[PDB]
Amino acid sequence: PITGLVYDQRMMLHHNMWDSHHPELPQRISRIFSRHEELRLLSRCHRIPARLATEEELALCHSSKHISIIKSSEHMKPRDLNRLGDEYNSIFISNESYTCALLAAGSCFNSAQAILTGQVRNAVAIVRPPGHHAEKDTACGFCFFNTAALTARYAQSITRESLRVLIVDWDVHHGNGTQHIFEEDDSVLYISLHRYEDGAFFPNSEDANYDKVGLGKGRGYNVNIPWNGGKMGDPEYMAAFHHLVMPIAREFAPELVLVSAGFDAARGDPLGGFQVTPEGYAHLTHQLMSLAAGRVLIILEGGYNLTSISESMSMCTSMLLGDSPPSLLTPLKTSATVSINNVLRAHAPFWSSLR
Ligand SMILES: O=C(NO)c1ccc(CN(CCO)C(=O)Cc2ccccc2)cc1
Ligand SMILES: [K+]
Ligand SMILES: [K+]
Ligand SMILES: [K+]
Ligand SMILES: [Zn+2]
Protein backbone atom coordinates (compact mmCIF):
# COMPACT_ATOMS: atom_id res chain seq x y z
CA PRO A 1 0.00 0.00 0.00
CA ILE A 2 2.60 2.46 -1.27
CA THR A 3 2.43 5.61 -3.43
CA GLY A 4 5.16 6.28 -5.99
CA LEU A 5 6.37 9.73 -7.03
CA VAL A 6 8.59 10.64 -9.98
CA TYR A 7 10.22 14.05 -10.43
CA ASP A 8 13.46 15.08 -12.11
CA GLN A 9 14.66 18.67 -12.21
CA ARG A 10 16.28 18.07 -15.62
CA MET A 11 12.77 18.51 -17.08
CA MET A 12 13.13 22.21 -16.18
CA LEU A 13 15.65 22.67 -19.00
CA HIS A 14 12.93 22.97 -21.67
CA HIS A 15 12.37 26.71 -21.95
CA ASN A 16 11.16 29.54 -24.19
CA MET A 17 14.24 31.50 -25.24
CA TRP A 18 12.13 34.27 -26.82
CA ASP A 19 9.60 34.84 -24.00
CA SER A 20 10.84 33.91 -20.55
CA HIS A 21 7.37 34.71 -19.13
CA HIS A 22 5.53 32.19 -21.30
CA PRO A 23 3.15 30.38 -18.89
CA GLU A 24 4.51 26.84 -19.48
CA LEU A 25 7.37 27.69 -17.05
CA PRO A 26 10.18 25.40 -15.90
CA GLN A 27 9.25 26.24 -12.33
CA ARG A 28 5.82 24.62 -12.75
CA ILE A 29 7.33 21.27 -11.75
CA SER A 30 9.82 22.56 -9.18
CA ARG A 31 7.06 24.47 -7.39
CA ILE A 32 4.84 21.38 -7.28
CA PHE A 33 7.76 19.29 -6.01
CA SER A 34 8.61 21.88 -3.33
CA ARG A 35 5.03 21.96 -2.10
CA HIS A 36 5.10 18.16 -1.72
CA GLU A 37 8.15 18.59 0.51
CA GLU A 38 6.59 21.42 2.54
CA LEU A 39 3.44 19.34 3.17
CA ARG A 40 5.61 16.33 4.17
CA LEU A 41 4.15 14.22 1.36
CA LEU A 42 7.48 13.59 -0.37
CA SER A 43 8.90 11.57 2.53
CA ARG A 44 5.77 9.37 2.52
CA CYS A 45 6.20 8.39 -1.15
CA HIS A 46 8.44 5.80 -2.75
CA ARG A 47 10.69 7.72 -5.15
CA ILE A 48 10.59 6.28 -8.68
CA PRO A 49 13.54 7.23 -10.94
CA ALA A 50 13.06 9.15 -14.16
CA ARG A 51 14.45 7.69 -17.38
CA LEU A 52 14.47 8.53 -21.07
CA ALA A 53 11.79 7.06 -23.24
CA THR A 54 13.34 5.18 -26.17
CA GLU A 55 12.54 6.02 -29.78
CA GLU A 56 10.99 2.57 -30.15
CA GLU A 57 8.70 3.43 -27.22
CA LEU A 58 7.70 6.72 -28.85
CA ALA A 59 6.73 4.72 -31.94
CA LEU A 60 3.95 3.10 -29.87
CA CYS A 61 1.92 6.22 -30.74
CA HIS A 62 3.98 8.49 -33.00
CA SER A 63 5.17 8.34 -36.61
CA SER A 64 8.86 7.89 -37.34
CA LYS A 65 8.83 11.23 -39.17
CA HIS A 66 7.46 13.12 -36.17
CA ILE A 67 10.00 11.52 -33.82
CA SER A 68 12.84 12.34 -36.21
CA ILE A 69 11.75 15.99 -36.58
CA ILE A 70 11.54 16.65 -32.84
CA LYS A 71 14.79 14.78 -32.26
CA SER A 72 16.48 16.99 -34.86
CA SER A 73 15.66 20.09 -32.81
CA GLU A 74 18.36 19.04 -30.32
CA HIS A 75 21.01 20.39 -32.70
CA MET A 76 19.25 23.47 -34.14
CA LYS A 77 20.31 27.10 -33.92
CA PRO A 78 17.73 29.57 -32.51
CA ARG A 79 16.50 30.73 -35.92
CA ASP A 80 15.67 27.15 -36.88
CA LEU A 81 14.08 26.34 -33.52
CA ASN A 82 11.87 29.37 -34.13
CA ARG A 83 11.01 28.18 -37.64
CA LEU A 84 10.28 24.62 -36.51
CA GLY A 85 8.15 25.69 -33.56
CA ASP A 86 6.12 27.93 -35.89
CA GLU A 87 5.16 24.91 -38.02
CA TYR A 88 2.89 23.82 -35.14
CA ASN A 89 -0.06 25.28 -33.25
CA SER A 90 1.30 26.89 -30.04
CA ILE A 91 4.74 25.29 -29.69
CA PHE A 92 8.07 26.69 -28.54
CA ILE A 93 11.27 24.64 -28.78
CA SER A 94 14.73 24.79 -27.22
CA ASN A 95 17.69 22.44 -27.68
CA GLU A 96 16.62 20.67 -24.47
CA SER A 97 12.96 20.12 -25.41
CA TYR A 98 13.37 16.69 -27.00
CA THR A 99 15.26 15.30 -24.00
CA CYS A 100 12.76 16.76 -21.55
CA ALA A 101 9.89 15.22 -23.52
CA LEU A 102 11.68 11.85 -23.41
CA LEU A 103 12.12 12.17 -19.63
CA ALA A 104 8.46 13.05 -19.15
CA ALA A 105 7.38 9.92 -21.03
CA GLY A 106 10.04 7.64 -19.54
CA SER A 107 9.12 8.79 -16.03
CA CYS A 108 5.52 7.75 -16.61
CA PHE A 109 6.58 4.38 -18.06
CA ASN A 110 8.64 3.65 -14.95
CA SER A 111 5.64 4.68 -12.84
CA ALA A 112 3.24 2.42 -14.77
CA GLN A 113 5.78 -0.39 -14.45
CA ALA A 114 6.04 0.14 -10.68
CA ILE A 115 2.24 -0.13 -10.41
CA LEU A 116 1.89 -3.15 -12.72
CA THR A 117 4.74 -5.08 -11.02
CA GLY A 118 3.19 -4.42 -7.60
CA GLN A 119 6.00 -2.25 -6.25
CA VAL A 120 3.49 0.55 -5.59
CA ARG A 121 -0.30 0.76 -5.60
CA ASN A 122 -0.58 4.18 -7.25
CA ALA A 123 1.72 7.00 -8.28
CA VAL A 124 2.09 10.66 -9.25
CA ALA A 125 4.30 11.99 -12.06
CA ILE A 126 5.45 15.63 -11.84
CA VAL A 127 6.57 16.03 -15.45
CA ARG A 128 6.83 18.57 -18.25
CA PRO A 129 6.44 19.36 -21.13
CA PRO A 130 2.81 18.15 -21.23
CA GLY A 131 1.51 15.56 -23.67
CA HIS A 132 -2.22 15.37 -24.35
CA HIS A 133 -2.38 17.73 -27.37
CA ALA A 134 0.36 15.81 -29.19
CA GLU A 135 -0.87 13.77 -32.17
CA LYS A 136 0.58 10.73 -33.92
CA ASP A 137 2.24 12.95 -36.52
CA THR A 138 2.52 16.42 -34.99
CA ALA A 139 3.27 18.54 -31.90
CA CYS A 140 0.65 20.91 -30.53
CA GLY A 141 -0.30 23.09 -27.58
CA PHE A 142 3.01 22.95 -25.65
CA CYS A 143 3.08 19.11 -26.15
CA PHE A 144 5.63 17.11 -28.15
CA PHE A 145 4.81 13.45 -27.46
CA ASN A 146 1.60 12.15 -25.91
CA THR A 147 2.90 10.93 -22.57
CA ALA A 148 -0.44 9.59 -21.31
CA ALA A 149 -1.25 7.79 -24.58
CA LEU A 150 2.24 6.32 -24.71
CA THR A 151 1.93 5.14 -21.11
CA ALA A 152 -1.30 3.29 -21.92
CA ARG A 153 0.43 1.51 -24.82
CA TYR A 154 3.52 0.83 -22.69
CA ALA A 155 1.27 -0.72 -20.02
CA GLN A 156 -0.26 -2.96 -22.68
CA SER A 157 3.22 -3.82 -23.97
CA ILE A 158 4.22 -5.44 -20.65
CA THR A 159 0.89 -7.14 -19.89
CA ARG A 160 -1.48 -7.82 -22.78
CA GLU A 161 -2.44 -5.87 -25.88
CA SER A 162 -6.07 -5.66 -24.69
CA LEU A 163 -5.38 -4.45 -21.12
CA ARG A 164 -8.28 -2.11 -20.30
CA VAL A 165 -6.90 1.36 -19.62
CA LEU A 166 -9.06 4.30 -18.58
CA ILE A 167 -7.66 7.76 -19.29
CA VAL A 168 -9.45 10.52 -17.40
CA ASP A 169 -8.40 13.91 -18.76
CA TRP A 170 -9.44 16.74 -16.45
CA ASP A 171 -7.12 19.35 -17.94
CA VAL A 172 -9.33 22.29 -18.90
CA HIS A 173 -8.46 21.71 -22.58
CA HIS A 174 -9.57 18.84 -24.80
CA GLY A 175 -6.88 16.19 -25.24
CA ASN A 176 -7.22 16.13 -29.02
CA GLY A 177 -4.18 13.90 -29.48
CA THR A 178 -5.33 11.32 -26.94
CA GLN A 179 -8.81 11.17 -28.48
CA HIS A 180 -7.40 10.63 -31.98
CA ILE A 181 -4.77 8.06 -30.97
CA PHE A 182 -7.43 5.85 -29.37
CA GLU A 183 -10.48 6.80 -31.46
CA GLU A 184 -10.84 3.30 -32.98
CA ASP A 185 -9.78 1.46 -29.80
CA ASP A 186 -12.04 -0.30 -27.29
CA SER A 187 -9.12 -1.22 -24.99
CA VAL A 188 -8.52 2.41 -23.98
CA LEU A 189 -11.50 4.41 -22.73
CA TYR A 190 -10.86 8.16 -23.06
CA ILE A 191 -12.98 10.48 -20.90
CA SER A 192 -12.28 14.21 -21.19
CA LEU A 193 -13.89 17.12 -19.37
CA HIS A 194 -13.01 20.39 -21.05
CA ARG A 195 -14.05 23.94 -21.68
CA TYR A 196 -15.45 24.07 -25.22
CA GLU A 197 -17.50 27.27 -25.81
CA ASP A 198 -18.83 25.89 -29.11
CA GLY A 199 -15.29 25.81 -30.50
CA ALA A 200 -14.05 29.20 -29.31
CA PHE A 201 -11.78 27.67 -26.64
CA PHE A 202 -8.42 26.08 -27.50
CA PRO A 203 -7.82 23.81 -29.41
CA ASN A 204 -10.84 25.16 -31.36
CA SER A 205 -12.11 21.96 -33.00
CA GLU A 206 -15.56 20.36 -33.05
CA ASP A 207 -13.67 17.09 -32.41
CA ALA A 208 -14.17 18.03 -28.75
CA ASN A 209 -17.99 17.97 -28.82
CA TYR A 210 -20.16 15.43 -27.00
CA ASP A 211 -21.28 13.67 -30.19
CA LYS A 212 -17.75 12.42 -30.96
CA VAL A 213 -18.20 9.02 -29.32
CA GLY A 214 -15.49 6.97 -31.05
CA LEU A 215 -15.15 5.10 -34.34
CA GLY A 216 -15.50 1.47 -35.37
CA LYS A 217 -14.88 -0.96 -32.55
CA GLY A 218 -14.06 2.12 -30.45
CA ARG A 219 -17.61 3.46 -30.72
CA GLY A 220 -18.70 4.34 -27.20
CA TYR A 221 -15.10 4.45 -25.90
CA ASN A 222 -14.59 8.22 -26.33
CA VAL A 223 -16.49 10.42 -23.87
CA ASN A 224 -16.27 14.21 -24.34
CA ILE A 225 -17.85 16.38 -21.63
CA PRO A 226 -17.74 19.90 -23.08
CA TRP A 227 -18.48 23.01 -21.02
CA ASN A 228 -20.13 26.10 -22.53
CA GLY A 229 -21.12 29.38 -20.96
CA GLY A 230 -18.23 30.49 -18.76
CA LYS A 231 -17.04 29.61 -15.29
CA MET A 232 -17.41 26.04 -13.97
CA GLY A 233 -16.12 24.66 -10.67
CA ASP A 234 -16.50 21.95 -8.04
CA PRO A 235 -20.31 21.53 -8.35
CA GLU A 236 -20.12 20.94 -12.10
CA TYR A 237 -17.09 18.62 -11.93
CA MET A 238 -18.59 16.60 -9.08
CA ALA A 239 -21.83 16.25 -11.05
CA ALA A 240 -20.04 15.16 -14.22
CA PHE A 241 -18.22 12.52 -12.18
CA HIS A 242 -21.46 11.41 -10.49
CA HIS A 243 -23.58 11.09 -13.63
CA LEU A 244 -21.00 10.20 -16.27
CA VAL A 245 -17.35 9.51 -15.41
CA MET A 246 -17.87 7.05 -12.57
CA PRO A 247 -20.85 5.04 -13.95
CA ILE A 248 -19.12 4.61 -17.31
CA ALA A 249 -15.77 3.78 -15.72
CA ARG A 250 -17.35 1.14 -13.48
CA GLU A 251 -19.01 -0.48 -16.50
CA PHE A 252 -15.70 -0.44 -18.41
CA ALA A 253 -13.93 -2.01 -15.39
CA PRO A 254 -10.43 -0.65 -16.13
CA GLU A 255 -7.30 -2.57 -15.11
CA LEU A 256 -5.28 0.67 -14.96
CA VAL A 257 -6.37 4.30 -14.59
CA LEU A 258 -4.27 7.14 -16.02
CA VAL A 259 -5.20 10.74 -15.19
CA SER A 260 -4.21 13.42 -17.67
CA ALA A 261 -4.09 15.77 -14.69
CA GLY A 262 -3.85 19.31 -15.93
CA PHE A 263 -4.61 21.83 -13.22
CA ASP A 264 -5.61 24.68 -15.52
CA ALA A 265 -9.28 24.32 -14.56
CA ALA A 266 -8.19 25.46 -11.10
CA ARG A 267 -9.30 28.59 -9.29
CA GLY A 268 -6.73 31.22 -10.15
CA ASP A 269 -5.59 29.83 -13.51
CA PRO A 270 -5.30 32.70 -16.04
CA LEU A 271 -5.74 30.44 -19.08
CA GLY A 272 -8.58 28.19 -17.96
CA GLY A 273 -10.96 30.65 -16.35
CA PHE A 274 -12.56 27.98 -14.13
CA GLN A 275 -12.80 27.59 -10.37
CA VAL A 276 -12.07 23.97 -9.33
CA THR A 277 -10.58 24.04 -5.81
CA PRO A 278 -7.81 21.85 -4.37
CA GLU A 279 -10.46 20.09 -2.30
CA GLY A 280 -12.37 19.45 -5.51
CA TYR A 281 -9.40 17.76 -7.15
CA ALA A 282 -8.98 15.72 -3.98
CA HIS A 283 -12.55 14.44 -4.30
CA LEU A 284 -12.05 13.62 -8.00
CA THR A 285 -8.90 11.62 -7.17
CA HIS A 286 -10.60 9.78 -4.30
CA GLN A 287 -13.42 8.69 -6.64
CA LEU A 288 -10.97 7.37 -9.24
CA MET A 289 -9.14 5.39 -6.53
CA SER A 290 -12.22 3.17 -6.27
CA LEU A 291 -11.38 1.83 -9.76
CA ALA A 292 -8.89 -0.75 -11.02
CA ALA A 293 -8.09 -2.00 -7.48
CA GLY A 294 -6.59 1.46 -6.86
CA ARG A 295 -4.07 1.28 -9.72
CA VAL A 296 -4.03 5.00 -10.56
CA LEU A 297 -1.24 7.09 -12.14
CA ILE A 298 -1.66 10.87 -12.01
CA ILE A 299 0.26 12.60 -14.83
CA LEU A 300 0.77 16.37 -14.85
CA GLU A 301 -0.49 18.04 -18.02
CA GLY A 302 -1.24 21.79 -18.03
CA GLY A 303 -1.87 24.23 -15.21
CA TYR A 304 -0.34 27.69 -15.05
CA ASN A 305 -0.98 29.34 -11.65
CA LEU A 306 2.07 28.14 -9.73
CA THR A 307 0.35 28.32 -6.34
CA SER A 308 -2.85 26.70 -7.66
CA ILE A 309 -1.15 23.75 -9.33
CA SER A 310 1.18 23.16 -6.36
CA GLU A 311 -1.68 23.00 -3.86
CA SER A 312 -4.00 21.05 -6.19
CA MET A 313 -1.59 18.31 -7.22
CA SER A 314 -0.37 17.95 -3.63
CA MET A 315 -3.97 17.36 -2.54
CA CYS A 316 -4.20 14.60 -5.16
CA THR A 317 -1.05 12.93 -3.81
CA SER A 318 -2.47 13.20 -0.27
CA MET A 319 -5.52 11.23 -1.47
CA LEU A 320 -3.35 8.59 -3.16
CA LEU A 321 -1.52 8.18 0.16
CA GLY A 322 -4.86 7.34 1.80
CA ASP A 323 -5.59 10.61 3.61
CA SER A 324 -9.24 11.34 4.35
CA PRO A 325 -10.88 13.60 1.73
CA PRO A 326 -11.46 17.18 2.88
CA SER A 327 -14.92 18.59 3.43
CA LEU A 328 -16.44 20.06 0.28
CA LEU A 329 -24.68 20.52 -3.08
CA THR A 330 -24.47 23.87 -4.84
CA PRO A 331 -26.84 24.04 -7.84
CA LEU A 332 -25.17 23.62 -11.22
CA LYS A 333 -24.85 26.33 -13.80
CA THR A 334 -27.76 25.83 -16.17
CA SER A 335 -25.51 25.22 -19.16
CA ALA A 336 -23.61 22.51 -17.24
CA THR A 337 -26.86 20.58 -16.81
CA VAL A 338 -27.37 20.96 -20.57
CA SER A 339 -23.86 19.64 -21.24
CA ILE A 340 -24.19 16.64 -18.92
CA ASN A 341 -27.55 15.67 -20.42
CA ASN A 342 -26.17 15.96 -23.96
CA VAL A 343 -23.40 13.52 -23.07
CA LEU A 344 -25.86 11.17 -21.35
CA ARG A 345 -28.00 11.13 -24.50
CA ALA A 346 -24.94 10.51 -26.66
CA HIS A 347 -23.65 7.57 -24.61
CA ALA A 348 -26.78 5.79 -23.35
CA PRO A 349 -26.72 3.58 -26.52
CA PHE A 350 -23.31 2.24 -25.38
CA TRP A 351 -23.42 2.14 -21.55
CA SER A 352 -26.32 0.44 -19.77
CA SER A 353 -25.47 2.26 -16.53
CA LEU A 354 -26.70 5.48 -18.20
CA ARG A 355 -30.18 4.17 -19.01
O1 LIG B 1 -1.69 22.94 -22.93
C2 LIG B 1 -2.31 23.96 -22.63
N3 LIG B 1 -2.90 24.05 -21.35
O4 LIG B 1 -2.78 22.98 -20.49
C5 LIG B 1 -2.40 25.13 -23.59
C6 LIG B 1 -2.04 24.98 -24.94
C7 LIG B 1 -2.09 26.05 -25.85
C8 LIG B 1 -2.51 27.34 -25.46
C9 LIG B 1 -2.56 28.50 -26.45
N10 LIG B 1 -3.19 29.75 -25.96
C11 LIG B 1 -4.64 29.87 -26.21
C12 LIG B 1 -4.97 30.13 -27.71
O13 LIG B 1 -3.93 30.93 -28.25
C14 LIG B 1 -2.41 30.78 -25.30
O15 LIG B 1 -1.21 30.60 -25.13
C16 LIG B 1 -3.04 32.12 -24.78
C17 LIG B 1 -2.10 33.23 -24.24
C18 LIG B 1 -1.40 33.09 -23.03
C19 LIG B 1 -0.55 34.10 -22.54
C20 LIG B 1 -0.38 35.31 -23.25
C21 LIG B 1 -1.07 35.47 -24.45
C22 LIG B 1 -1.92 34.45 -24.93
C23 LIG B 1 -2.87 27.50 -24.11
C24 LIG B 1 -2.81 26.42 -23.20
K1 LIG C 1 -9.60 17.57 -20.69
K1 LIG D 1 -15.16 10.17 -32.97
K1 LIG E 1 -11.18 5.05 -27.25
ZN1 LIG F 1 -4.62 22.62 -20.67
164 Cβ neighbours under 8 A, 6+ residues apart: 187, 188, 189, 252, 253, 254, 255, 256
d(CA 350, CA 355): 10
Resolution in angstroms comes to 1.8
Q: Please indicate the experimental technique that yielded this structure.
A: X-ray
Q: Integer distance in angstroms from the first to the last C-alpha of the chain? A: 36
- ∠ CA 343-349-352, rounded to 5°: 95
Q: Which residues contact 36 (CB under 8 A, 6 or more apart)?
A: 5, 42, 45, 126, 314, 317
> Which whole-number Å values give the CA distances from 207 to 176, 178, 213, 244, in the listed order?
7, 12, 10, 19
Ligand index nearest the alpha carbon of residue 179: 4
> DSSP per residue over 251-265, as a string?
HH--SEEEEEE--TT
d(CA 150, CA 17): 28
CA 165 remoteness from chain centre: 13
**Pocket flag, ligand 1, residue 24 (CB < 6 Å):** no
Range of the domain at 199: 1-355
Q: Are strands 46-47 and 122-126 parallel, antiparallel or unpaired?
A: unpaired
User: Other C-beta atoms within 10 Å of 253: how many?
Assistant: 11
- Nearest Cα residue to atom 21 of ligand 1: 22
Helix (H, G, I), strand (E, B) or coil at 342: helix
Cα–Cα distance measured from residue 240 to residue 225, given in angstroms and rounded to the nearest whole number: 8
Distance CA 195, CA 172 (A): 6
Mutate to test the pocket of ligand 1, among 90, 194, 306 (most ligand atoms within 8 A of CB): 90
* Residue 171 labeled ligand binder: yes
* DSSP state letters, 117-158: TTS-SEEEEE-SS--TT--SS--BTTBSS-HHHHHHHHHHHT
62 annotated binding-site participant: no
- Which CATH number covers residue 206? 3.40.800.20
- Looking at the 3D structure of the chain, how many domains does it have? 1
